[PDB]
Coordinates of C-alpha atoms and ligand atoms in Angstrom, one line a residue:
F47 CA 142.6 5.6 -19.2
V48 CA 141.7 7.9 -16.5
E49 CA 138.7 8.9 -18.2
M50 CA 137.7 5.2 -17.5
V51 CA 137.8 5.3 -14.1
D52 CA 134.9 4.9 -12.0
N53 CA 132.3 5.1 -15.4
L54 CA 130.4 2.0 -14.0
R55 CA 127.2 2.0 -11.2
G56 CA 124.9 -0.1 -10.6
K57 CA 122.5 -1.0 -7.6
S58 CA 123.6 -4.2 -5.3
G59 CA 122.1 -7.4 -6.9
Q60 CA 121.2 -5.9 -9.8
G61 CA 124.5 -5.6 -11.8
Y62 CA 126.8 -3.1 -13.4
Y63 CA 126.0 -0.6 -15.8
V64 CA 127.8 1.9 -18.6
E65 CA 126.5 5.0 -20.5
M66 CA 126.7 4.1 -23.7
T67 CA 125.1 6.2 -26.8
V68 CA 123.5 4.4 -30.2
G69 CA 122.6 6.0 -32.7
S70 CA 122.8 9.8 -34.9
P71 CA 122.0 12.3 -33.1
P72 CA 123.6 10.5 -30.3
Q73 CA 120.6 8.2 -28.1
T74 CA 121.7 7.9 -24.4
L75 CA 121.2 4.6 -22.6
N76 CA 123.2 2.6 -19.6
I77 CA 124.1 -1.0 -20.7
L78 CA 124.5 -3.6 -18.0
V79 CA 127.9 -4.9 -18.2
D80 CA 127.9 -8.7 -18.9
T81 CA 131.2 -10.6 -19.4
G82 CA 128.5 -14.0 -19.4
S83 CA 126.6 -13.8 -22.7
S84 CA 127.5 -12.0 -26.0
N85 CA 124.7 -9.8 -27.3
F86 CA 124.6 -6.1 -27.1
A87 CA 120.6 -5.8 -26.9
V88 CA 118.7 -3.2 -25.8
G89 CA 115.1 -1.8 -24.9
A90 CA 113.5 -0.9 -28.0
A91 CA 109.9 -0.8 -26.9
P92 CA 107.8 0.9 -24.0
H93 CA 108.5 -1.3 -21.1
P94 CA 106.9 -0.9 -17.3
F95 CA 110.7 -0.3 -15.9
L96 CA 112.8 1.5 -18.7
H97 CA 112.7 5.0 -18.1
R98 CA 113.5 5.5 -21.7
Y99 CA 114.9 2.9 -24.9
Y100 CA 116.5 3.0 -28.3
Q101 CA 114.1 4.6 -30.9
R102 CA 115.7 3.6 -34.2
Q103 CA 112.7 5.8 -36.2
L104 CA 114.9 8.7 -34.7
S105 CA 118.7 7.6 -36.1
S106 CA 119.9 8.5 -39.3
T107 CA 122.3 5.8 -39.1
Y108 CA 120.2 3.2 -37.8
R109 CA 120.0 -0.7 -40.5
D110 CA 117.3 -3.0 -40.5
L111 CA 119.0 -6.8 -40.8
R112 CA 116.4 -8.3 -41.4
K113 CA 116.5 -10.9 -39.3
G114 CA 114.4 -11.5 -35.4
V115 CA 116.8 -12.7 -32.6
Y116 CA 115.9 -13.6 -29.0
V117 CA 118.0 -14.7 -25.9
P118 CA 117.3 -17.1 -23.1
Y119 CA 119.0 -15.8 -19.8
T120 CA 119.5 -18.3 -16.9
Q121 CA 117.6 -14.9 -15.3
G122 CA 114.9 -13.5 -17.4
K123 CA 114.8 -13.3 -21.6
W124 CA 114.0 -10.9 -24.4
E125 CA 113.4 -11.5 -28.2
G126 CA 113.8 -8.6 -30.8
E127 CA 115.2 -7.6 -34.1
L128 CA 119.0 -7.2 -35.4
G129 CA 120.2 -4.1 -36.5
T130 CA 123.4 -2.5 -36.9
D131 CA 124.1 1.5 -35.4
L132 CA 126.8 3.6 -34.7
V133 CA 127.8 3.2 -30.6
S134 CA 130.0 5.0 -28.6
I135 CA 131.3 5.1 -24.7
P136 CA 131.0 8.5 -23.5
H137 CA 133.2 8.2 -20.3
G138 CA 135.5 5.0 -22.5
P139 CA 138.2 5.3 -25.8
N140 CA 137.3 8.2 -27.8
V141 CA 135.8 6.1 -31.2
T142 CA 132.4 5.3 -32.8
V143 CA 131.7 2.0 -33.8
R144 CA 129.6 0.4 -36.0
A145 CA 128.0 -2.5 -34.3
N146 CA 124.8 -4.9 -34.5
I147 CA 122.4 -4.4 -31.9
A148 CA 119.6 -6.2 -30.9
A149 CA 116.3 -4.0 -30.5
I150 CA 114.2 -5.8 -27.5
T151 CA 110.9 -5.9 -28.8
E152 CA 109.6 -7.9 -25.5
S153 CA 110.9 -9.7 -22.7
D154 CA 110.3 -11.6 -19.6
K155 CA 111.6 -10.8 -16.6
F156 CA 114.5 -9.5 -18.0
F157 CA 114.5 -5.6 -16.5
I158 CA 114.7 -5.0 -13.2
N159 CA 112.3 -2.3 -11.9
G160 CA 114.3 0.4 -10.5
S161 CA 117.9 -0.9 -11.9
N162 CA 119.2 1.8 -14.1
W163 CA 119.6 0.4 -17.2
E164 CA 117.8 0.1 -20.5
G165 CA 120.2 -2.8 -21.9
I166 CA 122.8 -5.5 -21.9
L167 CA 126.8 -5.1 -23.4
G168 CA 127.9 -9.4 -23.7
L169 CA 131.4 -9.3 -23.6
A170 CA 132.0 -12.8 -23.8
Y171 CA 132.9 -14.1 -27.5
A172 CA 130.7 -15.2 -30.6
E173 CA 130.6 -18.9 -29.9
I174 CA 127.5 -17.8 -27.7
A175 CA 126.2 -15.2 -29.3
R176 CA 122.5 -15.7 -30.7
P177 CA 121.0 -16.5 -33.5
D178 CA 124.5 -18.0 -34.0
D179 CA 128.1 -17.0 -33.8
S180 CA 127.9 -15.1 -36.8
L181 CA 126.2 -12.3 -35.4
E182 CA 130.3 -10.0 -34.5
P183 CA 130.0 -9.5 -30.4
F184 CA 130.5 -5.3 -29.5
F185 CA 133.7 -5.6 -28.3
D186 CA 135.3 -7.9 -31.2
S187 CA 133.3 -5.3 -33.6
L188 CA 135.4 -3.0 -31.4
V189 CA 138.9 -3.8 -31.9
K190 CA 138.8 -4.5 -35.5
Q191 CA 137.3 -1.2 -36.3
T192 CA 139.3 0.7 -34.2
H193 CA 142.9 0.9 -32.7
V194 CA 141.8 -0.5 -29.0
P195 CA 144.2 -3.4 -27.7
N196 CA 142.2 -6.5 -27.2
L197 CA 141.6 -6.4 -24.1
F198 CA 139.6 -4.8 -21.3
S199 CA 139.9 -5.2 -17.0
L200 CA 136.6 -4.6 -14.8
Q201 CA 136.9 -3.2 -11.1
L202 CA 133.5 -3.8 -9.5
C203 CA 133.2 -2.3 -6.0
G204 CA 130.8 -3.1 -3.2
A205 CA 129.0 -0.3 -1.3
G206 CA 131.8 2.6 -0.8
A216 CA 122.8 1.2 -1.2
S217 CA 124.6 2.1 -4.6
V218 CA 127.7 0.6 -6.3
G219 CA 130.5 1.4 -8.4
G220 CA 133.4 0.6 -10.6
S221 CA 135.4 1.0 -13.7
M222 CA 135.8 -0.9 -17.0
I223 CA 139.0 0.1 -18.5
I224 CA 138.5 -0.8 -22.5
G225 CA 141.6 -1.5 -24.4
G226 CA 144.4 -1.9 -21.4
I227 CA 145.3 -2.4 -17.7
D228 CA 145.3 1.0 -15.4
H229 CA 147.5 0.3 -12.2
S230 CA 146.0 3.2 -9.8
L231 CA 143.5 0.5 -9.6
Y232 CA 144.7 -2.2 -7.9
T233 CA 148.0 -3.3 -5.5
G234 CA 150.6 -6.0 -6.2
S235 CA 151.0 -8.3 -8.4
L236 CA 148.7 -9.4 -11.1
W237 CA 148.0 -13.8 -11.5
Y238 CA 146.3 -15.2 -14.6
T239 CA 145.0 -18.3 -15.3
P240 CA 144.8 -19.3 -19.2
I241 CA 140.7 -18.6 -21.0
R242 CA 140.1 -22.5 -21.6
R243 CA 138.0 -21.9 -24.5
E244 CA 136.8 -18.7 -26.1
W245 CA 132.9 -18.9 -25.8
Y246 CA 132.5 -18.0 -21.6
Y247 CA 135.3 -16.5 -19.8
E248 CA 136.3 -20.4 -18.7
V249 CA 139.0 -21.1 -16.6
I250 CA 139.2 -24.3 -14.2
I251 CA 139.8 -24.3 -10.6
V252 CA 142.1 -26.9 -8.9
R253 CA 141.2 -26.3 -5.1
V254 CA 138.7 -25.0 -2.4
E255 CA 139.5 -24.4 0.6
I256 CA 137.1 -22.8 3.4
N257 CA 138.7 -21.6 5.9
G258 CA 142.2 -22.7 5.1
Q259 CA 140.5 -26.1 5.3
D260 CA 140.4 -28.0 1.6
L261 CA 136.8 -29.2 1.0
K262 CA 139.1 -32.9 -0.4
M263 CA 136.8 -32.9 -3.8
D264 CA 138.1 -35.0 -7.2
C265 CA 138.5 -30.9 -8.9
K266 CA 136.7 -32.1 -11.8
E267 CA 133.3 -31.6 -9.5
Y268 CA 135.1 -27.6 -9.6
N269 CA 134.6 -27.6 -12.9
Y270 CA 131.4 -29.5 -13.2
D271 CA 130.0 -28.6 -17.2
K272 CA 131.9 -25.8 -17.0
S273 CA 133.9 -22.5 -14.6
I274 CA 132.8 -18.9 -16.0
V275 CA 133.8 -15.6 -14.8
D276 CA 130.1 -13.6 -15.1
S277 CA 130.3 -10.3 -14.0
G278 CA 126.5 -10.7 -15.1
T279 CA 125.5 -12.8 -12.1
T280 CA 125.5 -11.7 -8.8
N281 CA 126.2 -15.0 -6.7
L282 CA 128.7 -17.2 -6.6
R283 CA 126.8 -20.1 -8.3
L284 CA 127.8 -23.9 -7.6
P285 CA 127.6 -27.4 -8.6
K286 CA 125.4 -29.2 -6.7
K287 CA 127.9 -31.2 -5.0
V288 CA 130.0 -28.3 -4.8
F289 CA 127.2 -26.1 -3.2
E290 CA 126.3 -28.8 -1.2
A291 CA 129.8 -29.4 0.6
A292 CA 130.6 -25.4 0.7
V293 CA 127.4 -24.7 2.7
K294 CA 128.0 -28.0 4.8
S295 CA 131.6 -26.2 6.0
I296 CA 129.6 -23.3 6.0
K297 CA 127.1 -23.9 8.3
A298 CA 129.6 -25.7 10.6
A299 CA 131.4 -22.7 10.7
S300 CA 129.5 -20.5 12.0
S301 CA 127.2 -22.8 14.1
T302 CA 127.3 -20.5 17.1
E303 CA 124.2 -19.1 15.3
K304 CA 121.3 -20.6 13.9
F305 CA 119.5 -19.5 10.3
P306 CA 116.2 -20.6 8.5
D307 CA 117.6 -23.1 6.2
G308 CA 115.4 -20.8 3.4
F309 CA 118.0 -18.5 4.3
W310 CA 121.1 -20.6 3.4
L311 CA 118.6 -21.1 0.1
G312 CA 118.6 -17.6 -0.9
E313 CA 114.8 -16.9 -0.1
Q314 CA 115.2 -15.1 3.5
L315 CA 117.1 -12.4 5.0
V316 CA 119.4 -12.6 8.2
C317 CA 119.7 -9.5 9.8
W318 CA 121.8 -7.2 13.2
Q319 CA 121.2 -4.6 15.3
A320 CA 123.5 -2.8 12.9
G321 CA 127.3 -2.6 13.0
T322 CA 127.1 -5.8 14.9
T323 CA 127.3 -8.6 12.3
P324 CA 129.3 -11.3 13.6
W325 CA 132.3 -11.6 10.5
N326 CA 134.2 -13.7 12.6
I327 CA 132.6 -16.9 12.3
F328 CA 132.0 -17.1 8.7
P329 CA 134.6 -18.3 6.7
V330 CA 137.4 -17.3 4.0
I331 CA 136.6 -19.1 1.1
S332 CA 139.8 -20.2 -1.2
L333 CA 139.4 -20.6 -4.6
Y334 CA 142.5 -21.4 -7.3
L335 CA 143.0 -20.9 -10.4
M336 CA 145.3 -22.8 -13.0
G337 CA 148.4 -20.6 -13.5
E338 CA 150.3 -19.6 -16.4
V339 CA 152.8 -22.4 -16.0
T340 CA 153.6 -25.9 -15.2
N341 CA 152.4 -27.7 -12.0
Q342 CA 151.7 -23.9 -10.2
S343 CA 148.2 -22.3 -9.0
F344 CA 147.4 -19.2 -7.5
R345 CA 144.3 -18.3 -4.7
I346 CA 141.7 -15.8 -4.3
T347 CA 140.3 -15.7 -0.8
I348 CA 137.0 -14.6 0.0
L349 CA 135.6 -12.4 2.1
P350 CA 132.4 -13.0 4.2
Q351 CA 131.3 -9.4 3.3
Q352 CA 131.5 -10.5 -0.2
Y353 CA 129.0 -13.8 -0.3
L354 CA 126.5 -11.9 2.3
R355 CA 125.4 -8.9 0.4
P356 CA 123.8 -6.5 1.6
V357 CA 119.6 -5.6 1.4
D365 CA 119.7 -3.0 11.7
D366 CA 121.7 -5.1 9.5
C367 CA 120.2 -7.8 7.2
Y368 CA 121.9 -9.9 3.9
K369 CA 121.1 -12.3 1.7
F370 CA 123.7 -15.4 1.1
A371 CA 125.0 -14.8 -2.3
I372 CA 126.3 -18.6 -2.9
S373 CA 123.8 -20.9 -4.4
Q374 CA 123.0 -23.7 -6.6
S375 CA 123.9 -24.2 -9.9
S376 CA 123.6 -26.8 -13.3
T377 CA 125.3 -25.4 -16.0
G378 CA 128.8 -24.9 -13.7
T379 CA 131.1 -23.0 -11.4
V380 CA 129.5 -19.0 -11.9
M381 CA 132.2 -17.0 -10.2
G382 CA 129.7 -13.5 -10.1
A383 CA 129.8 -10.1 -9.3
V384 CA 130.1 -10.5 -6.0
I385 CA 133.1 -12.5 -6.4
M386 CA 135.0 -10.5 -8.7
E387 CA 133.8 -7.3 -5.9
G388 CA 137.4 -6.2 -4.7
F389 CA 139.3 -7.8 -7.0
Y390 CA 140.6 -5.7 -10.4
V391 CA 139.9 -8.4 -13.4
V392 CA 142.4 -8.3 -16.6
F393 CA 140.0 -10.3 -19.3
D394 CA 143.1 -10.3 -21.7
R395 CA 141.8 -11.9 -25.0
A396 CA 145.1 -10.9 -27.1
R397 CA 147.2 -12.9 -24.6
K398 CA 144.0 -15.9 -23.8
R399 CA 143.9 -15.3 -19.9
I400 CA 141.9 -13.6 -16.8
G401 CA 144.4 -11.7 -14.5
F402 CA 143.4 -10.8 -10.9
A403 CA 144.6 -8.5 -8.5
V404 CA 143.5 -7.0 -4.9
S405 CA 141.8 -3.7 -6.1
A406 CA 141.5 -0.3 -4.9
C407 CA 138.2 -0.7 -3.2
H408 CA 139.1 -3.9 -1.9
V409 CA 136.5 -5.4 0.6
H410 CA 138.1 -4.7 4.6
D411 CA 137.9 -6.9 7.5
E412 CA 140.0 -5.6 10.8
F413 CA 141.6 -9.0 10.9
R414 CA 141.0 -10.5 7.5
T415 CA 142.1 -9.6 3.7
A416 CA 140.7 -10.2 0.2
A417 CA 144.4 -11.7 -1.0
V418 CA 145.1 -12.8 -4.5
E419 CA 148.6 -14.6 -3.7
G420 CA 151.1 -17.6 -5.3
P421 CA 152.7 -19.6 -7.0
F422 CA 151.4 -22.4 -5.6
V423 CA 151.9 -26.2 -6.9
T424 CA 149.0 -28.7 -8.1
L425 CA 150.0 -31.2 -9.8
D426 CA 147.8 -33.3 -12.4
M427 CA 145.6 -29.5 -13.3
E428 CA 144.5 -31.3 -16.4
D429 CA 142.7 -33.0 -14.6
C430 CA 140.2 -30.5 -13.3
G431 CA 139.0 -29.4 -16.8
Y432 CA 136.1 -31.5 -18.0
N433 CA 135.1 -32.6 -21.0
Ligands
LIG1 C1 121.7 -9.1 -12.3 C2 120.8 -9.7 -11.7 C3 120.3 -11.3 -11.4 C4 119.8 -11.2 -9.9 N1 120.3 -13.0 -10.0 C5 120.4 -13.5 -11.2 C6 121.1 -14.5 -11.4 C7 121.4 -14.8 -13.2 C8 121.2 -13.4 -13.8 C9 122.0 -14.1 -14.8 O1 121.5 -15.1 -15.6 N2 123.0 -13.0 -16.1 C10 123.3 -13.2 -16.9 C11 122.5 -11.5 -17.7 C12 121.6 -10.6 -17.0 C13 121.9 -9.5 -16.6 C14 121.2 -8.8 -15.5 C15 119.8 -9.1 -15.8 C16 118.9 -10.8 -16.3 C17 120.4 -11.1 -16.7 C18 124.0 -13.6 -17.9 O2 124.4 -13.6 -19.4 C19 124.9 -15.4 -17.5 N3 125.8 -15.3 -17.6 C20 126.2 -17.3 -17.3 C21 125.3 -17.6 -19.0 N4 124.0 -17.4 -19.1 C22 123.2 -17.9 -20.0 C23 123.7 -17.5 -21.4 C24 123.1 -16.1 -21.9 C25 123.9 -16.1 -23.4 C26 124.4 -16.9 -23.9 C27 124.9 -18.8 -23.2 C28 124.3 -18.8 -22.2 C29 123.7 -15.6 -18.7 O3 122.2 -15.8 -18.4 C30 121.5 -12.2 -13.5 C31 120.7 -11.8 -11.7 N5 120.9 -15.5 -10.4 C32 121.1 -17.2 -11.1 S1 122.2 -15.5 -9.3 O4 122.8 -14.5 -9.4 O5 122.4 -16.8 -8.5 C33 120.3 -14.7 -7.6 C34 121.3 -13.9 -6.9 C35 119.4 -15.5 -7.6 C36 119.8 -13.5 -8.3

């Protein structure tokens, strides 16, 4: 697994990517790692924001599937042509797989100027694959065709400009975290869906029906930047965060994610922004654990200037990259569970720590799920 340590790079707010090759001879591309979708897709035609793209002409192993495809994301969309080809991950397990690939021929607000990735690796399950669930996702192909175990782990690290991390394919690398792993069930195999059973801000319970926390659903999504919260929860949370930080004032466009807020270098008043604890359903009866998030996670750095990285959703909670940052996150597909621990690259505050703590007792956790 040491071969996979530090195999991710990215720019802040523009995702994390891993190097892969496609085709014979191998064509090299940077691919964003997305646990929030299920298609493997690459630029396959010129685009202003692509430094390179997949050239199907030049691969002896390419096979056309004679079928088109499109995927609408929350941010941007693309369309293209389905095919298969041979795929490797150079800083990955030592294997070559024949996988479905969507060649992107048109797109809208998908590729990001200067991001340095040319494609996307949807690691979630077939149920949300386009055009439908008969298009086997990449990780399913990988597992079926090799002896790679059915799990991967993600260590997303913040700054320390440019970001990095590790994607361990096939297991858990114990040098990437400290303390104990805490596991929450995958509620259903489509998104990496989970259930949040309690929320506290600076130790104060939001005191909402826990169904609200999962209104629609809650997912763990490395392809989304922000922590995204259903309307009612978002409003409760911002209220509590404003009140905690009310010795300063911010344009409420800051609270909407539109405007930066800046302080003289090294003077950011971290102490006035609360910690946020999300309690997740545990593995045994009436048992949960919490992950605690620092303001250094949800004030994304862009003097020292930041964007508010908590925003509103209408498709459920999205535990995005800024939540995953500093945690070591195990996507244990084999045992239908998501593990969290404190990362080796965890986020540092001089008087506060990000934590994964348990056990907690929580009654009636099944009521927190939404139908
Ligand atoms: C990193 C750029 C980025 C910046 N922001 C957002 C952003 C979101 C998403 C987002 O969308 N990510 C997609 C994949 C993707 C990744 C890179 C570029 C395009 C797309 C993911 O897959 C998502 N996972 C849940 C289900 N769905 C819908 C779906 C797809 C396929 C099958 C079923 C369902 C997603 O699209 C990306 C960004 N923000 C809104 S936000 O964080 O708050 C923001 C601060 C306003 C800005």
